[PDB]
């Protein structure tokens, strides 16, 4: 029972950092598009 | 303008379509959160 719960825990929580890596990569490349969108929205807001 | 008009609206697109990516993404990673938690605790008790 231990091996079964260390082995459990042990994919689970790889996989849990594999997930949280590509939800970081993926919320700062948000982050980047999102202060382009609003730099470009005042530009246009600007330009007309 | 008619062109930074453009490239905020593509920007807002792909903007979208990552977080639609995201909502699959927080909601699995969650579930493999809850099931990565009471395990812990069990390989704690087990190895005490």
């Given at each position: 029972?231990?091996?079964?719960?260390?082995?459990?825990?042990?994919?689970?929580?790889?996989?849990?950092?594999?997930?949280?890596?590509?939800?970081?990569?993926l919320?700062?490349?948000?982050?980047?598009?999102?202060?382009?969108?609003?730099?470009?929205?005042?530009?246009?807001?600007?330009?007309? | 303008?008619?062109?930074?008009?453009?490239?905020?609206?593509?920007?807002?697109?792909?903007?979208?379509?990552?977080k639609?990516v995201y909502?699959?993404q927080?909601?699995?990673?969650?579930?493999?959160?809850?099931?990565?938690?009471?395990?812990?605790?069990?390989?704690?008790?087990?190895?005490?």
């Amino acid at each position: 029972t231990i091996n079964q719960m260390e082995i459990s825990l042990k994919e689970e929580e790889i996989q849990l950092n594999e997930a949280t890596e590509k939800t970081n990569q993926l919320l700062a490349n948000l982050d980047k598009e999102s202060k382009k969108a609003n730099q470009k929205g005042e530009e246009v807001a600007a330009t007309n | 303008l008619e062109k930074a008009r453009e490239d905020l609206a593509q920007i807002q697109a792909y903007i979208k379509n990552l977080k639609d990516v995201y909502t699959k993404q927080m909601e699995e990673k969650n579930e493999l959160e809850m099931k990565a938690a009471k395990t812990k605790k069990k390989i704690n008790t087990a190895r005490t």
